Amino acid sequence: SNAMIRKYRYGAPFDTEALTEKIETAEEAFPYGEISQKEGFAFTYIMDEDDIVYGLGESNRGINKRGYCYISNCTDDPIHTEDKRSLYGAHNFIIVSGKTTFGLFFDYPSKLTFDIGYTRMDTLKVSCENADLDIYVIEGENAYDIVKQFRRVIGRSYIPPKFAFGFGQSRWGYTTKEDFRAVAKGYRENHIPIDMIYMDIDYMQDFKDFTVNEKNFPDFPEFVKEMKDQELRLIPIIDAGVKVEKGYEVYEEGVKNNYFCKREDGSDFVAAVWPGDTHFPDMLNPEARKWFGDKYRFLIDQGIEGFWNDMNEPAIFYSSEGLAEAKEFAGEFAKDTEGKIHPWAMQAKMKDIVNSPEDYKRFYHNVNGKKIRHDKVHNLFGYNMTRAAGEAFERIDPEKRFLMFSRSSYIGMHRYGGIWMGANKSWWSHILLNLKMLPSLNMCGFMYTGADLGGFGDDTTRDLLLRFLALGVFTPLMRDHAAEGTREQECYQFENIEDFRSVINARYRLVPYLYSEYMKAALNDDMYFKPLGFVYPDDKMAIRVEDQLMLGNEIMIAPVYEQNARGRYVYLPEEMKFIKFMPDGSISEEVLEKGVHYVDVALNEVPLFIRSGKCIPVAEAAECVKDIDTENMQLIGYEGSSYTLYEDDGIHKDYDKKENYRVLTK
Amino acid sequence: SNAMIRKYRYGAPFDTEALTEKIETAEEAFPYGEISQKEGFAFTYIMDEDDIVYGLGESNRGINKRGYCYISNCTDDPIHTEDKRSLYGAHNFIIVSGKTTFGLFFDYPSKLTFDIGYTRMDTLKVSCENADLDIYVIEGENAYDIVKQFRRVIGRSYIPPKFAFGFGQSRWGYTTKEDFRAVAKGYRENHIPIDMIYMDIDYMQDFKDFTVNEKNFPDFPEFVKEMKDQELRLIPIIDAGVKVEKGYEVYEEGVKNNYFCKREDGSDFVAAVWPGDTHFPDMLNPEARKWFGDKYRFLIDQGIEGFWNDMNEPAIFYSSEGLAEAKEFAGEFAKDTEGKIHPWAMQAKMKDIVNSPEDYKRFYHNVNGKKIRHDKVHNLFGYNMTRAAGEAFERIDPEKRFLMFSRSSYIGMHRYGGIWMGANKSWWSHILLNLKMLPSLNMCGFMYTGADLGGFGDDTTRDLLLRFLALGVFTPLMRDHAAEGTREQECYQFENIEDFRSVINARYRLVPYLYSEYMKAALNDDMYFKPLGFVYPDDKMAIRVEDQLMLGNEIMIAPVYEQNARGRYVYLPEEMKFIKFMPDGSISEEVLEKGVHYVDVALNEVPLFIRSGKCIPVAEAAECVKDIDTENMQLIGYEGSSYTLYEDDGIHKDYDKKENYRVLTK
């Protein structure tokens, strides 16, 4: 089809500000399927048997979304299993790809249900409670063309500083300078590369946003510099909830200036999170956003160059109302002698007060003099928290890139920060799940992304971490961050440390190439990771591959994701050079023809494939991003090919200089 | 190595009667690794890097058990996640396979921990609280030889009646005659093959074992006949817990004759399950065992020819003690004004009263006057419940085979019934899990096995059901039994029901072959399913394949287990004929050479591979086992090959007759 984007408006949509490009309202009949405004809103479309459905960004299941139900409803779940319908992100863009091909973006800020062949195999049904939304229809040559059009109108993706393409580490539990010093020493003295150490909630004073524990960090700026002098940048977490505490300045200011979300009666809503009772900044109120974002100056002025935003669905352990209800019910259960209240009913009530739909109807946002109940705009919360930070960085230092990523998100947030897929338990299934999400995230603007393995208890075995890190080599966010209750030993503490050094070395050897492809893609509103079907649209086998990805225009990745495996099957849609980074520092190469192959990949080997007629630069291993030698890089791949390398200072925003680009020829 | 079996005795083991062959106590030092009795019992062994560890029957993870922790401790968990350490069965047989190869059976009836490279990759450690156990060491030239020796000493596996090789259907909520009549009608009017309909707990009078609801089934024997006249055999469930109810004969007899498990003070221990308060029959008390098993006559005399035993870990929703503790805790939570008792602690207490280790220490078995605390022999409960039934069948009708399978088990129970792998979710990952478990189950004597999907609502999508059934085609227990909180998932309830009919037709066409292989294996203490490494021991690639299985000596299976997939990769260790049962009743054939292939398999096609120089008989599709025409079967496979068909009357036990064997030549 001829490229076209049209916007169909229903009712009176809340302005989410997802798009940067203004699309005029289309007046003509809606061009695909059927629209009903009877029971709220529903779009219904009958798919052809061969149709593939792409999109939904951070959502469960596979690259082809057919065959299940997905609900856009920012949610933090304890475990990511196959039946979960909602993850942390609400990314309402889908592309139907087949004989009839088109994209749809449903710009709607509340619970949106995508029944993608779940109820009836041939039926796509997208529904929500109120017909107040904009639907963008995108037409084009194919799915990839449709994605590129969408990427244009949602505005340029967030771009991290180059140090963020290094490796990072963190543990929920690091509290003192001494803990951080031991990690720094463990990596540097064992020559494992690293650029970042993440600080979890224990660095704060009693879990208070925009404080540092003064007992532990009396001289925090000096410690920040101590780490930075060793090319270790500390990246502190910020939470959505601001502790209720008299005399705490962030709390006092929020109360005085009405910057917190309020109950129906205008009192400040209380949600318990890590600090106990908290209030939530009204992320949808521009004045509150400016105030909250400006608080980041507290840490930036101490030498911090990156942040991560958490618990921003927002998470609620319980509300004052929910806790009271639960205690009342517990009292009834305690006194019940007639078998009225079953133990499982008691258990359910306790589970029900966590992230409760009832609580999301108990507080409001103040948006242009109007109070809007939170549930009606729930999916915008994390988005606007991260927007608050991003906009504050632009005011503080317009020309500087800060590392920034968020748990919850909605399209539009992709301009301000990346995302990470969190986890609690260490599962093999996490590897494939995260691989599959990558292209979908890219379709929706989120290019700086990565995942956590889990880390709880002793469940992270050596081989699981090694395979997880070998996927991480390619994801812009690559870190080993372990969750609460972790007893995960450090990379330098596992048996045969050289294997970990090998995998992380591979990341650093690839940084110039990966950074270059990230920059070329971000600056041109293109994808960093692509499904095979976007690159080989005429190959019926290629279009259905879900456990391999194309990266940039030069390579294909295919990580091993099965325990005890010494290799895996791949499909090559053209001739490629199969490359492995070896634990002795060498790079092995084998030419493989188009077709099916089984390739050997040891735990301490990192594989990739270089496409026919392409090459990539590979640096010698270095232990931090600053020390990578990009003057003397070898070119791996096909004789006679060339590669355009993007390289800037990695710090500022001087993107449009011709000097940033140089052609390398093998 | 030269075949041999030695028994090493530690302490004063409880006699589990797992082995039928008596082995003398060896007096030499333990032949492999090291044994410690410093703190309970521990066996520690250093594995070679290439060693594969087989075994553990019904356990999590893969065929090669290396890289995780497994605890033998019969348990019913709400969700079978990849991190779970214990399933329903405790099958303490492992084989280390490599440069040095040997098998070990740990005959110990309590919590047994297998740390198989979980803590340290090269270390196998098996441990338990008390050094009172027998350890059998089995030597042989290879893992398969070692398995065959083990199968000899544990005694011949349970053999089902031939009707049990048909297809079965059930739903938790079937309650009335009309419920069952609708199933009979739906299947038979649509020419969908079927032999069995399962009866879940609603057929009883108020969940009372060995009753039938007389309002719903006024003349049950007449109804059983109504069904049997249409070749539908009703298969009723029996639970471990006998309802506490005055006037209920099973309860009154148990109380009067001290046939229930008692608390320390001699009172009958109370456990809540489906009927509310129940007592558990004392399965280790020989008189109580005989009494409980004899109760099956109630149903046998009414025309019932099969049973399934459930909740027999035994499951406990709560005990009287646990409930009282939970209520006390709840009272404290309710009155807490200082926030000392957190809601998650309340939630945890509620969770903790279900299947509680503390409850398993509260009741005892009386074995000839010797009182044994249940936890010390926990893994023997389900085994002995099923033994009770099996021994009663032998007294009631020695010449007749009954269908019998059980949820919980221990080696030794394999002589008396099969097992099924239940579930509370409908996950694609459970297809692969169940596939991988099959050979391990066969190693431990359990050949009559199969699995369920158990998701709620409409979470079992049409395509998942079809792929699940396509694995089921090959598993001796093949049924579609759906949970309570679920849509109706009968094969005649989906859009294009021909697809379901096609898959079940494939089963029936294969019944003569599958039954023949089952009988030959059972009668010769051999495996029905085998890992590829057992058949192609010299092929380094074959030995590590985990998502294909060999069946008998003729075929290989390789089910598709990925959503939206139209085919899958396979490795063929020799030339084979790739065949597919097609929806039009045809059978496609293609010769494929040794090596790697991607094969196309549609949702409504059932694939298998016939080995070079082999053939199998394939019958025309029939709608019940009785109607299968075995006189005029096709031979599919290689010209010049032969197949020996075992066929008997399928009802009695006349196995040792030359006339049971017929040689077919293609």
Automatic annotation (TrEMBL), chains A, B:
One of its GO terms (molecular function) is hydrolase activity, hydrolyzing O-glycosyl compounds. Transmembrane segments: none annotated. GO terms for biological process: carbohydrate metabolic process. Its EC number is 3.2.1.-. The keyword Hydrolase applies. The keyword Hydrolase applies. Keywords: Glycosidase, Hydrolase. It holds the Pfam family Glyco_hydro_31_2nd. Residues 158-516 form the Glycoside hydrolase family 31 TIM barrel domain. Residues 32-115 form the Glycoside hydrolase family 31 N-terminal domain. Residues 528-616 form the Glycosyl hydrolase family 31 C-terminal domain. InterPro entries: Gal_mutarotase_sf_dom, GH, Glyco_hydro_31_AS, Glyco_hydro_31_C, Glyco_hydro_31_N_dom, Glyco_hydro_31_TIM. Belongs to the glycosyl hydrolase 31 family. This is Glycosyl hydrolase, family 31. It comes from Blautia obeum ATCC 29174.
